[PDB]
């Protein structure tokens, strides 16, 4: 937490560094909060950025009504 990890697999985060897990570029649902948009889960242990659900933009126009 907080301290720079030049002094003390190794992954550099905003809140310090993480030892024991590998960082991936994909997105997963957050289970273990870490801080500054980092979340970890075990499937081996990995770390990933915060995923805010799924991106979904509904169609918008000058005349389009939706009634269930």
């Amino acid at each position: 937490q907080g301290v720079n990890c030049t002094e003390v697999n190794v992954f550099q985060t905003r809140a310090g560094c993480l030892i024991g897990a590998e960082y991936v570029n994909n997105s997963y649902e957050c289970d273990i909060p870490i801080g500054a948009g980092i979340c970890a889960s075990y499937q081996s242990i990995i770390a990933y950025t915060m995923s805010l659900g799924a991106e979904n933009s509904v169609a918008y126009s000058n005349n389009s009504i939706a009634i269930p």
Partner: protein, 404 residues
Amino acid sequence: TNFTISVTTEILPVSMTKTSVDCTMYICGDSTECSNLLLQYGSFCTQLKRALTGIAVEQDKNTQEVFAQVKQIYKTPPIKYFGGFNFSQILPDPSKPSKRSPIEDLLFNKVTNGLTVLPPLLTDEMIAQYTSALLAGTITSGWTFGAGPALQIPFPMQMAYRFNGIGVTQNVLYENQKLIANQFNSAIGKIQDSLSSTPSALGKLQDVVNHNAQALNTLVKQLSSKFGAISSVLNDILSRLDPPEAEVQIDRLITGRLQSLQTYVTQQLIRAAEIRASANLAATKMSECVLGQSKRVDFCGKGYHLMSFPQSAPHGVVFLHVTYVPAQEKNFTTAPAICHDGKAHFPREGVFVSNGTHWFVTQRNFYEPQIITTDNTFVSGNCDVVIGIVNNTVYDPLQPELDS
């Protein structure tokens, strides 16, 4: 007769800075005397760390709950046309890599060792994404998107829906639609000027930040005091005095620092309860005035509340309450009922109004003359028990059209 639309700002803080305090290293820097004497007080500093971790987890839960109230994020269409409603300084600008609207950019620019300052779980990027998604959901899905799957409704008809829900007939919206759009743009410009002008409008966030910084500064200042002992230095007494002879001095020092840490933690704890209550109130405000329109008055801004814009802010949330401000009053004469052909008549939803002798009907908060007909009235009782009733005829529909 004529109405204007203004916008106000409400700032409610959300989450203070999380602080983590270790006991042993705060009491003394790497000394074995504290290791062999702090446990003689029992597990005292353990519950302090337990309480501070509890504050950290409830602050994280609070800042998660105050914003993440949607299951899916919403993205604006690339076409910026909204039927005359220009949203440029409200919609986030993709030119800046941080994806911020200029209003919260100006608000961010205006608002400014054994301790540990933990970073928040949500940084400003995901808060900006939350505000952008909520703004998109409240502009393109109307007021019905939190009850289930996403819908789409164009802007003018859901303006008409909100005007119907506020207590006026929806026909008056299209009469001055461009006037309402121009007044909205002028109000957005004026509130941007007010945000850029007033320096004390954001006093709550600066107040809580200054309170936390001042508490930490007084903690640090009172740490370096002697507390009635010989030396104020943490480790100079280890070599200057015999460790048999330093027991009373180190006991007084550790109990004084323990009392100071206890009163600091209680003050912080109380404040933490206050900021949790304030952020819960802000969460109720967002859940009432953003997720759909509300009918209760004087809750979100001054006047009749239509809808609000939530925007990002450091350690808080700022709202843009869009209100209905009536004006252009005019004196008129009224009557509770009208008696026609020996039978009493009552208004369906409005009131009988007459400038001179000609009587007309109109809605509650807007003035427009209408012909008194049968379809907007009913017969119940006679014109004998009522008071203040006037005498006038009622024009009967379907009377002069069925004769031929």
